[PDB]
Enzyme design. Sequence first.
Site, PDB file in Angstrom:
ATOM      1  N   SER A   1      17.619 -17.193 -41.043  1.00 30.92           N
ATOM      2  CA  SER A   1      17.485 -17.638 -40.143  1.00 30.92           C
ATOM      3  C   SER A   1      16.205 -17.569 -39.867  1.00 30.92           C
ATOM      4  CB  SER A   1      17.793 -17.476 -38.717  1.00 30.92           C
ATOM      5  OG  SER A   1      17.577 -17.542 -37.812  1.00 30.92           O
TER       6      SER A   1
ATOM      7  N   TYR B   1      19.425 -10.521 -31.613  1.00 33.26           N
ATOM      8  CA  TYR B   1      19.575 -11.649 -32.482  1.00 33.26           C
ATOM      9  C   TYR B   1      18.829 -11.412 -34.323  1.00 33.26           C
ATOM     10  CZ  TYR B   1      20.129 -15.714 -35.289  1.00 33.26           C
ATOM     11  OH  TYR B   1      20.363 -17.470 -35.779  1.00 33.26           O
TER      12      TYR B   1
HETATM   13  C1  LIG Z   1      11.530 -18.996 -33.149  1.00 30.78           C
HETATM   14  C2  LIG Z   1      11.812 -20.823 -32.573  1.00 30.78           C
HETATM   15  C3  LIG Z   1      11.092 -21.511 -32.807  1.00 30.78           C
HETATM   16  C4  LIG Z   1       9.348 -21.236 -32.454  1.00 30.78           C
HETATM   17  C5  LIG Z   1       9.211 -20.802 -31.530  1.00 30.78           C
HETATM   18  O1  LIG Z   1       7.659 -19.703 -30.819  1.00 30.78           O
HETATM   19  C6  LIG Z   1      10.051 -20.030 -30.762  1.00 30.78           C
HETATM   20  C7  LIG Z   1      11.468 -19.862 -30.652  1.00 30.78           C
HETATM   21  C8  LIG Z   1      12.211 -20.151 -29.822  1.00 30.78           C
HETATM   22  C9  LIG Z   1      14.351 -20.727 -30.814  1.00 30.78           C
HETATM   23  C10 LIG Z   1      14.538 -20.303 -32.052  1.00 30.78           C
HETATM   24  C11 LIG Z   1      13.499 -21.104 -32.433  1.00 30.78           C
HETATM   25  C12 LIG Z   1      13.229 -21.777 -34.207  1.00 30.78           C
HETATM   26  C13 LIG Z   1      15.437 -21.136 -34.867  1.00 30.78           C
HETATM   27  C14 LIG Z   1      16.081 -19.867 -33.997  1.00 30.78           C
HETATM   28  C15 LIG Z   1      15.054 -19.013 -34.344  1.00 30.78           C
HETATM   29  C16 LIG Z   1      17.817 -20.260 -33.760  1.00 30.78           C
HETATM   30  O2  LIG Z   1      17.840 -20.129 -35.440  1.00 30.78           O
HETATM   31  C17 LIG Z   1      18.175 -20.041 -33.335  1.00 30.78           C
HETATM   32  C18 LIG Z   1      16.943 -19.803 -32.070  1.00 30.78           C
HETATM   33  C19 LIG Z   1      16.075 -21.021 -32.577  1.00 30.78           C
END
Ligand SMILES: C[C@]12CCC(=O)C[C@@H]1CC[C@@H]1[C@@H]2CC[C@]2(C)[C@@H](O)CC[C@@H]12
Lengths: 284, 284
Positions: free
Chosen positions: B142, B155
């Site tokens: 991830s 997480y």
């Molecule tokens: C970090 C990111 C991407 C960049 C950000 O500034 C905040 C945002 C919050 C949700 C995350 C997302 C990227 C993909 C993730 C890490 C998924 O795996 C689950 C939650 C998502």
Amino acid sequence: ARTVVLITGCSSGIGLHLAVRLASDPSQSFKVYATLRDLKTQGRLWEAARALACPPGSLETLQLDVRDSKSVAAARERVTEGRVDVLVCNAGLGLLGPLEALGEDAVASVLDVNVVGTVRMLQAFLPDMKRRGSGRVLVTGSVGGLMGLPFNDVYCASKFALEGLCESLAVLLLPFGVHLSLIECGPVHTAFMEKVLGSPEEVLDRTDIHTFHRFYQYLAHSKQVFREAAQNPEEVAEVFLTALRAPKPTLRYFTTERFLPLLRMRLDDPSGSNYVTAMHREVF
Amino acid sequence: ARTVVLITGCSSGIGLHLAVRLASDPSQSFKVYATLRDLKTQGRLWEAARALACPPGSLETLQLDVRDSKSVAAARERVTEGRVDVLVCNAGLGLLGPLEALGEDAVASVLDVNVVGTVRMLQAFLPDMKRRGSGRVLVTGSVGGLMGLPFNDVYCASKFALEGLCESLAVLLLPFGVHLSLIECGPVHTAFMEKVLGSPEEVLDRTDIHTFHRFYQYLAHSKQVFREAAQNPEEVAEVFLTALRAPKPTLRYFTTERFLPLLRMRLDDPSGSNYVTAMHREVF
Ligand SMILES: C[C@]12CCC(=O)C[C@@H]1CC[C@@H]1[C@@H]2CC[C@]2(C)[C@@H](O)CC[C@@H]12
Ligand SMILES: C[C@]12CCC(=O)C[C@@H]1CC[C@@H]1[C@@H]2CC[C@]2(C)[C@@H](O)CC[C@@H]12
């Protein structure tokens, strides 16, 4: 008044030295709460404290089991000044050996203490620091939390965990006024550590002779690295102080630069093939 | 004969699609073991499997609780071919919310499933792959395992853990002939995920109105990122296949490059001050 600091895992190593290094400060600006899981281990904290002539009342000992929130809560109430200015999350366990040779409970203990124990400390102490709009939290890191090391899979996992956990919080704490910083330590001169490495027959029956052979090979290699790269805890402890004092601390401080070349090649290649390779040769 | 693959956490998302994507392969070169924690959730795996017309016997379902080694051992014995060629460690839990608002059991469950559950899978399956001198292990990564994200502390910790754990093993497995690779996924289009985000009053009573306000703010931001960056699981699943087939797989594969610019600035500054800063602005 006096900066109130609570440190976990003070029965030895960095925790111990940092505790007495803070309480023995000529300026006497620090009130230290050195917590340990088992009080029967406070001996060295105290003998060390007599050695540095810590003024009485500059060092209080508390029983704290970071594997237990009740203990975390109870010790937090023992802080008479009803406030902690510097919280040092140092308690941590190591784990060396083939993954298949590690007991399930052992794996769970290391994450429970190193990661979840740190979460509980952060949960119980972060709120007030947030409310008061001030405070500093320092967490002992490790080169093992920045790069993977053979036969340290679970140790590195928990150290990597700590990196993720602190970096995540850091993004949220930036505007809150509370500073979080990781102190990435390389090997830290410990006569017992170099003793902990050396498990023959017990590990042999839990893994194959080829992995076993590589283990020995890795033990041999850590041995060298330690005997020629290990830092004095007085030296490492002085970094905590550097961070604790910096007006604008950075998310992380490095106690040495020896492992910085390796870390760079780590993100000079996100695929990890370069590091895994350098590190394999590097150890075998 | 036929490549035997065992995948964990197949009741939905990447696990589900990968399972049926492998079993439905026109070449029929794969025998898939889709394990799920609760069998009452196999419905979608099966409807999806009918949709791709997976030939009968190309997909077997197994109950597997990665929080239990006995279940891990029992499912491993259900693999009639007495061998696994491709083990996919996909089972994982998420956790969003202020650190202080996360239940202790919740924190422990996420590490237990995401990290220790993966350890148990590796412990039970790595040996034979080592003995046989062959095999491929893929672990769902991830972007959260490569950089810290606000309100994802636990997480990210577990995802960071996985990075450390796999990188450590990777150094040891290089000459053993068994390949380990992490599949770093960015957001993966899931209608429920965008639904999971939205906890008002319950989170409000567990944290301060300023953190709470930032949470909402972050929820709002993930919402956007998802609705404009989320990848189809068919797309992500195709990366697993790319890795599974590469003659010399790298330690990690990226399903997208969207988050690669952010990751670079992460090691273009080991102090973490640049990333914490970009990421804070980036989210608030
Ligand atoms: C970090 C990111 C991407 C960049 C950000 O500034 C905040 C945002 C919050 C949700 C995350 C997302 C990227 C993909 C993730 C890490 C998924 O795996 C689950 C939650 C998502
Ligand atoms: C990774 C290193 C340093 C480089 C290497 O190739 C193997 C060796 C193994 C023992 C590690 C050591 C650096 C410091 C560590 C990570 C200590 O924190 C505990 C175990 C030590």
